[PDB]
Design an enzyme around this catalytic site. Structure first.
Site, PDB file in Angstrom:
ATOM      1  N   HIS B  41      24.291-121.744   5.137  1.00 52.57           N
ATOM      2  CA  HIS B  41      25.578-121.404   5.770  1.00 52.57           C
ATOM      3  C   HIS B  41      25.736-121.953   7.203  1.00 52.57           C
ATOM      4  O   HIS B  41      26.786-121.661   7.835  1.00 52.57           O
ATOM      5  CB  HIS B  41      25.807-119.886   5.703  1.00 52.57           C
ATOM      6  CG  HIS B  41      25.013-119.066   6.683  1.00 52.57           C
ATOM      7  ND1 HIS B  41      23.916-118.317   6.301  1.00 52.57           N
ATOM      8  CD2 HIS B  41      25.183-118.831   8.007  1.00 52.57           C
ATOM      9  CE1 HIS B  41      23.446-117.656   7.348  1.00 52.57           C
ATOM     10  NE2 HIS B  41      24.197-117.952   8.395  1.00 52.57           N
ATOM     11  N   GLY B 143      22.899-115.139  15.316  1.00 50.66           N
ATOM     12  CA  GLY B 143      22.141-116.351  15.561  1.00 50.66           C
ATOM     13  C   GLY B 143      20.695-116.315  15.125  1.00 50.66           C
ATOM     14  O   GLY B 143      19.982-117.311  15.321  1.00 50.66           O
ATOM     15  N   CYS B 145      19.596-116.191  12.048  1.00 49.40           N
ATOM     16  CA  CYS B 145      19.342-116.761  10.735  1.00 49.40           C
ATOM     17  C   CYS B 145      18.469-118.004  10.847  1.00 49.40           C
ATOM     18  O   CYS B 145      18.558-118.776  11.808  1.00 49.40           O
ATOM     19  CB  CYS B 145      20.655-117.097  10.027  1.00 49.40           C
ATOM     20  SG  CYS B 145      21.471-115.616   9.454  1.00 49.40           S
TER      21      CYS B 145
HETATM   22  C1  LIG Z   1      22.496-115.219  10.831  1.00 51.85           C
HETATM   23  N1  LIG Z   1      22.473-115.811  11.936  1.00 51.85           N
HETATM   24  C2  LIG Z   1      23.253-113.909  10.628  1.00 51.85           C
HETATM   25  C3  LIG Z   1      22.280-112.726  10.829  1.00 51.85           C
HETATM   26  C4  LIG Z   1      23.075-111.379  10.873  1.00 51.85           C
HETATM   27  C5  LIG Z   1      23.964-111.373  11.956  1.00 51.85           C
HETATM   28  C6  LIG Z   1      23.882-109.908  12.583  1.00 51.85           C
HETATM   29  N2  LIG Z   1      22.529-109.359  12.091  1.00 51.85           N
HETATM   30  C7  LIG Z   1      22.043-110.171  11.112  1.00 51.85           C
HETATM   31  O1  LIG Z   1      21.007-110.027  10.527  1.00 51.85           O
HETATM   32  N3  LIG Z   1      23.759-113.821   9.268  1.00 51.85           N
HETATM   33  C8  LIG Z   1      25.189-113.499   8.971  1.00 51.85           C
HETATM   34  O2  LIG Z   1      26.004-113.281   9.814  1.00 51.85           O
HETATM   35  C9  LIG Z   1      25.563-113.404   7.502  1.00 51.85           C
HETATM   36  C10 LIG Z   1      26.096-114.711   6.779  1.00 51.85           C
HETATM   37  C11 LIG Z   1      27.599-114.502   6.490  1.00 51.85           C
HETATM   38  C12 LIG Z   1      27.935-113.202   6.949  1.00 51.85           C
HETATM   39  N4  LIG Z   1      26.551-112.496   7.305  1.00 51.85           N
HETATM   40  C13 LIG Z   1      26.291-111.056   7.410  1.00 51.85           C
HETATM   41  O3  LIG Z   1      25.179-110.710   7.663  1.00 51.85           O
HETATM   42  C14 LIG Z   1      27.442-110.092   7.130  1.00 51.85           C
HETATM   43  N5  LIG Z   1      26.843-109.219   6.160  1.00 51.85           N
HETATM   44  C15 LIG Z   1      27.444-109.112   4.832  1.00 51.85           C
HETATM   45  O4  LIG Z   1      28.450-109.695   4.559  1.00 51.85           O
HETATM   46  C16 LIG Z   1      26.722-108.217   3.818  1.00 51.85           C
HETATM   47  F1  LIG Z   1      26.967-106.904   4.049  1.00 51.85           F
HETATM   48  F2  LIG Z   1      27.101-108.582   2.551  1.00 51.85           F
HETATM   49  F3  LIG Z   1      25.376-108.412   3.973  1.00 51.85           F
HETATM   50  C17 LIG Z   1      27.992-109.378   8.392  1.00 51.85           C
HETATM   51  C18 LIG Z   1      29.147-108.452   7.939  1.00 51.85           C
HETATM   52  C19 LIG Z   1      28.532-110.426   9.399  1.00 51.85           C
HETATM   53  C20 LIG Z   1      26.893-108.511   9.045  1.00 51.85           C
HETATM   54  C21 LIG Z   1      26.637-114.978   5.381  1.00 51.85           C
HETATM   55  C22 LIG Z   1      26.694-116.457   4.952  1.00 51.85           C
HETATM   56  C23 LIG Z   1      26.257-113.826   4.402  1.00 51.85           C
END
Ligand SMILES: *C(=N)[C@H](C[C@@H]1CCNC1=O)NC(=O)[C@@H]1[C@@H]2[C@H](CN1C(=O)[C@@H](NC(=O)C(F)(F)F)C(C)(C)C)C2(C)C
Ligand SMILES: *C(=N)[C@H](C[C@@H]1CCNC1=O)NC(=O)[C@@H]1[C@@H]2[C@H](CN1C(=O)[C@@H](NC(=O)C(F)(F)F)C(C)(C)C)C2(C)C
Lengths: 306, 306
Positions: B41, B143, B145
């Site tokens: 992503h 950030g 990820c």
């Molecule tokens: C990577 N950098 C982030 C790590 C997240 C950010 C806040 N704490 C973490 O662990 N990953 C994301 O933002 C991912 C990514 C899109 C949206 N996302 C989420 O973690 C979202 N969670 C969900 O949609 C759920 F509930 F299905 F897990 C969010 C609502 C922004 C927390 C993708 C591609 C899943």
């Protein structure tokens, strides 16, 4: 999202660990530029340990008596000296992996990471606090001496602890990197005990702010308190007095959450007087006191290191 | 002496972290030989996140669209491909700090260290377990990820986790290094929830052995139990069934302490039925389930890494 006991990345310190052997005694040393720092009792036999005369024992050593190994490479010792409880071995090779560094003496209540090592090789990393009684609650085995504690700030490693011994009750004692013990301990196998410890109040408050930031807010009550009245209650529960300096250090967390420090103090007061009633805060059933205000800010804001 | 949640030394992994930017999205990547692995992503805009077609989004990228930075040095991308939920960027420079490594898929109940990173720079290290519901209880911010989880065995880094998202209740989800999610999760901003979790019984038993080794023995009772009768009790407390494989893995700790596994099971049974009555084990007021049998052996025996 989440709150964990978190250590600093250990790589900069890993590149400084070596093995130091004198006679049949082996422990860890710290190699920075062309000097290896290690606990002076590397020069002791088992029987020397009970009442050692370190100056006398060192008189009868010469440079070649010290076997210093950095991985598979022996480092030739070309000079040696004693500074308080640390031996300094000058070697003929500067460590090319030396990070920018400082030697600091930390204050009770501050935290640091420990890189536990055996035979110059790293085993694991964990976070510790310097307790108010100048011990640390570590995890150390035979041969762990010379393992160090440190903090990192961007690219600079501040070394603050070198491991020397374990006391009754299993808490640990050591020196700064100038060889001066934290607390009233000596590097001698003799009857010694830690004084009674106290709970680090400013850190418990820091951790309650971390709980609020992370969505755990059930313990927040509707009251405030004065600093004096809080300290009267805390004293009874063996909590250390909260100073204005502590209040000031909590300011960033107070500003971030919109909860005045003295309001959080009122909520802590209630927890101390009533307990947690089977509930948890950040997954713990006890109040945690080994996160500093900076630890909380660093973890909840994602501060990184170079 | 002492028992702490302990991470592996992180230096071998630190030398592999890079920053990956595509468009305005930046996250962490893992640089091994001439390949950078990162969450796919990175190629999404904010609005792509809700229902992304990763294959379509990647069709419209070319190599030069990927800005890969290792410290201050940009690494030229010369090829790219998608493998499940990970992007693989071939770069024109092999990482000279690549450790010996393996990609492994871990099983629920096993632990690993996480090196939390932002913008390719390490922030901290902590220990996690893969929960029975295939989430992990981490600490991650925006950030984070591409941060990875790993175990070390002598000189070999076994990478087992890449971070992708946070779920409701604040637990975390990600992939192995082949891009396959742990659990029934997808990398899409859509309604998803972890299933109900369970307590990792074999790990709680491991930690009771660690308590005995470290002198905390008050909970040891005089009874034994059968495996069947233990599992009947444990099931009621949302503990996972204890298998003969689990019994076998506990064998080294049982042999070291002289306490048969089924005897420890009888003591755990009593703790579950009666509670701990205000007392602690290894400083905790709850039973801990994120130490594996190997974690206990490694910490109580001082296993080191090359
Ligand atoms: C990577 N950098 C982030 C790590 C997240 C950010 C806040 N704490 C973490 O662990 N990953 C994301 O933002 C991912 C990514 C899109 C949206 N996302 C989420 O973690 C979202 N969670 C969900 O949609 C759920 F509930 F299905 F897990 C969010 C609502 C922004 C927390 C993708 C591609 C899943
Ligand atoms: C360094 N490698 C070890 C680390 C110890 C060993 C077991 N767990 C640890 O933290 N340091 C020592 O063995 C030091 C050292 C002589 C004896 N010693 C002790 O830790 C002893 N403790 C004490 O004498 C006491 F209680 F005063 F702290 C021991 C009884 C062996 C645990 C010297 C030079 C103090």
């Amino acid at each position: 999202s989440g709150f964990r006991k978190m250590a600093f990345p250990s790589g900069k310190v890993e590149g400084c660990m070596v093995q130091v052997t004198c006679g049949t005694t082996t422990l860890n040393g710290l190699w920075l530029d062309d000097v290896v720092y290690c606990p002076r009792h590397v020069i002791c036999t088992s029987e020397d340990m009970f009442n050692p005369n370190y100056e006398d024992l060192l008189i009868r050593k010469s440079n070649h008596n010290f076997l210093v190994q950095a991985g598979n490479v022996q480092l030739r010792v070309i000079g040696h000296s004693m500074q308080n409880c640390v031996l300094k071995l000058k070697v003929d090779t500067a460590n090319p992996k030396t990070p920018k560094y400082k030697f600091v003496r930390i204050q009770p209540g501050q935290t640091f990471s420990v890189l536990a090592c055996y035979n110059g090789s790293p085993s694991g990393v964990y976070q510790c606090a310097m307790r108010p009684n100048f011990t640390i609650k570590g995890s150390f085995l035979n041969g762990s001496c010379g393992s160090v504690g440190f903090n990192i700030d961007y690219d600079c490693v501040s070394f603050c602890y070198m491991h020397h011994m374990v006391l009754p009750t299993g808490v640990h004692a050591g020196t700064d990197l100038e060889g001066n013990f934290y607390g009233p301990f000596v590097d001698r196998q003799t009857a010694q005990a830690a004084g009674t410890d106290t709970t680090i109040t400013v850190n418990v408050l820091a951790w309650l702010y971390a709980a609020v930031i992370n969505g755990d807010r059930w313990f927040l009550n509707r009251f405030t308190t004065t600093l004096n009245d809080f300290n009267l209650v805390a004293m009874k529960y063996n909590y250390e007095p909260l100073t204005q300096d502590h209040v000031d250090i909590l300011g960033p967390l107070s500003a971030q959450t919109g909860i005045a420090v003295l309001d959080m103090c009122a909520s802590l007061k209630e927890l101390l007087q009533n307990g947690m009633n089977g509930r948890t805060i950040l997954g713990s059933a006890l109040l945690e006191d080994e996160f500093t205000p900076f630890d909380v800010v660093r973890q909840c804001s994602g501060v990184t290191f170079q």
